[PDB]
Amino acid sequence: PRGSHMNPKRIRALKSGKQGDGPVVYWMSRDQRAEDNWALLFSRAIAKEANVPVVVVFCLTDEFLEAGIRQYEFMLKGLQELEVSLSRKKIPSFFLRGDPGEKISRFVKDYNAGTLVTDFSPLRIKNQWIEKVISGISIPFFEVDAHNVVPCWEASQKHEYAAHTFRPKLYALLPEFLEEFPELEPNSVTPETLSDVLETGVKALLPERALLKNKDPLFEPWHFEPGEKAAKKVMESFIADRLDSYGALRNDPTKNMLSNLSPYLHFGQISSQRVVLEVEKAESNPGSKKAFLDEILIWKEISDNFCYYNPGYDGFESFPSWAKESLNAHRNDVRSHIYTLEEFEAGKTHDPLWNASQMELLSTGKMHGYTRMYWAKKILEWSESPEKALEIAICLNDRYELDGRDPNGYAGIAWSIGGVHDRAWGEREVTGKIRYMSYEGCKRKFDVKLYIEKYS
DNA sequence: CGGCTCGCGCA
DNA sequence: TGCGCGAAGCCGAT
Ligand SMILES: Cc1cc2nc3c(=O)[nH]c(=O)nc-3n(C[C@H](O)[C@H](O)[C@H](O)COP(=O)(O)OP(=O)(O)OC[C@H]3O[C@@H](n4cnc5c(N)ncnc54)[C@H](O)[C@@H]3O)c2cc1C
């Protein structure tokens, strides 16, 4: 659909029909940003070709009840900043409350939409919302992959077994899909309160807030303030100050040398393609650049591939045959310790390293990338069954992680418990052939005493 | 057949 | 800390 600096492979037609005579409507779900947005740049071009304005719709759902205030305030505060940014380019933002499957279809007919465009997401709920809108609209419906550098359907047409099989496919398509972002052209034809929806949300999530003994909340919101502007500063400081030492100190939780970009990347407050563009042109350490590029390109977009081609990505069935047979044979094995969800949530285990890792999660909303493996693998070792281990790990991940409810989370949890995108290892009791990590293993790689003392 | 994102003994 | 090896099942380039 027109456009010079616009690859048609990033878009795909979800429905066909006659184009309406009204404005094009962009359904923003995953990429909550105004700059470096392919789903928004594509919508503007269709608006420009049809001589119609472009509108923006965001449907606030009841999914915030499953999460806490840490994720609600992070998403809401960025939307208020995004509302101002879109207002500077004569683009209107409409915020709705309810089911997108019924409110979006009502918004298309009420506003007389000509075309409908949305961003890509491999989650189950999004496909259910799309099918509901599909049956309630008669205007063309398009979808743009504005999250991945290479479109998910274009990178691979099959659930990839490992990264070493997905690595040659992604890097072969990089010279085509890795490109600069054209500027967002403002509108030519111009035609709920976010503050009110913020107070009503925190009031409904107050009783479920994480608290300490003295009735003091555990979350510390000053570590990462949200917003598109704040996401840029974190990226800029990483390239200039933390990119050089990334390849050597990425597995040390005592050193704050990670990019800290997941909370912004999950909500779409910054484009991962923009991160690649600035990282590629930076004169850093070559070993650190390759290590970082493999993390945000191969392992971030293969999680989308995992959830897209596996509808049961958060279940035991999505595990490989070798892991399922290994875990089933050790179901009756006696566990050294058995902890419930509440004991894992409050950090009441015998391991001071695991408890400290959970405290970093409960205090900052983000846990170090290295300790997340030990946090999840120890749940499998100290649970009733692999199903309960998967349930506890997913619950604690989606409730307290700022980057939770993400394809990176489900793939990452399935890696630690089900060996997805991994291989077999030494045979052990309970865990079987799943990769094993011990407290002594972390002792020889980083100062464990510094990590435990930092988070009580 | 070669190589995959741990623990372990050893400088 | 950094390095080579062990231990394990399997994809895919042929
Ligand atoms: C059990 C478990 C659960 C996880 N939960 C989540 C989650 O809920 N949300 C989430 O976004 N990530 C999750 N991850 C992935 C990883 O822990 C985080 O992406 C990372 O630790 C966030 O810190 P960072 O962005 O500073 O890391 P960096 O080293 O700076 O990574 C840069 C970016 O690369 C990507 N990335 C890095 N490591 C991974 C990985 N292992 N898998 C996929 N993408 C990766 C992310 O987009 C990240 O923002 C989890 C990992 C594990 C093992």
Amino acid at A186: P
| Distance from Cα A186 to the centre of ligand 1, integer Å | 35
Whether the CB of A442 is less than 7 Å away from nucleic strand B comes out as yes
Task: Verify that A302 and A153 share a domain, yes or no.
Answer: yes
Buried b (16+ CB within 10 A) or exposed e, A170-192: beebeeebeeeeeebeebeeeee
Residue A374, classified by CB atoms within 10 Å of its CB into exposed (0-12), middle (13-18) or buried (19+), is: buried
Task: Verify that A192 and A100 share a domain, yes or no.
Answer: no
State the DSSP code for A217. B
Task: Verify that A209 and A305 share a domain, yes or no.
Answer: yes
Task: Verify that A301 and A327 share a domain, yes or no.
Answer: no
Task: Verify that A77 and A151 share a domain, yes or no.
Answer: no
* Tally of CB atoms within 10 A around A382: 20
Three-point CA angle A215, A221, A227, nearest 5°: 150
Task: Verify that A121 and A196 share a domain, yes or no.
Answer: no
A57 lines ligand 1 (CB under 6 A): no
Query: Closest Cα partner for A104 from A87, A91, A117?
Result: A117
Q: Which nucleotides of B are covered by protein (CB under 7 A)?
A: 3-10
Task: Verify that A276 and A376 share a domain, yes or no.
Answer: no
Task: Verify that A172 and A308 share a domain, yes or no.
Answer: yes
Domain boundary among the residues A94, A117, A146 is at A146
Q: Alpha-carbon distance A209 to A10, whole Å?
A: 40
Q: Which nucleotides of C are covered by protein (CB under 7 A)?
A: 1-2, 6-13
Q: What is the resolution of this structure in A?
A: 2.2
A273 lines ligand 1 (CB under 6 A): no
- Beta carbons within 8 Å of A161's beta carbon, 6+ residues apart: A320, A421
Distance of CA A158 to the CA centre of its chain: 21
Task: Verify that A416 and A430 share a domain, yes or no.
Answer: yes
Looking at ligand 1, which atom is closest to the CA of residue A373? 53
Distance of CA A237 to the CA centre of its chain: 21
Task: Verify that A35 and A156 share a domain, yes or no.
Answer: no
Number of structural domains found in chain A: 3
Domain boundary among the residues A97, A129, A146 is at A146
Three-point CA angle A214, A219, A220, nearest 5°: 110
Task: Verify that A243 and A176 share a domain, yes or no.
Answer: yes
CA Rg value for chain A: 22
Å from A301 (CA) to C4 (C1')? 32
Q: Alpha-carbon distance A405 to A117, whole Å?
A: 23
Domain boundary among the residues A102, A124, A146 is at A146
Query: From the C1' of C2, which residue's alpha carbon is nearest?
Result: A445
Whether the CB of A399 is less than 7 Å away from nucleic strand C comes out as no
Q: Alpha-carbon distance A414 to A327, whole Å?
A: 13
Q: Alpha-carbon distance A253 to A374, whole Å?
A: 12
Task: Please answer whether residues A44 and A135 qualify as being in contact, where contact means their C-beta atoms are separated by less than 8 angstroms.
Answer: no
A35 lines ligand 1 (CB under 6 A): no
Helix A407-418 × helix A321-329 angle, to 10°: 50
The DSSP bridge pattern shows strands A24-27 and A116-119 to be: parallel
Specify the 3-state DSSP secondary structure of A211: strand
Residue A387: domain span:
316-456
Task: Verify that A245 and A165 share a domain, yes or no.
Answer: yes
Q: Alpha-carbon distance A135 to A108, whole Å?
A: 12
| Distance from Cα A291 to the centre of ligand 1, integer Å | 13
Å from A18 (CA) to B6 (C1')? 56
Task: Please answer whether residues A114 and A21 qualify as being in contact, where contact means their C-beta atoms are separated by less than 8 angstroms.
Answer: yes
A269 lines ligand 1 (CB under 6 A): no
Query: Closest Cα partner for A433 from A418, A454, A446?
Result: A418
DSSP element (H, E) containing A143: strand A141-144
Alpha carbon distances (Å) from A271 to A145, A177, A251:
11, 14, 24
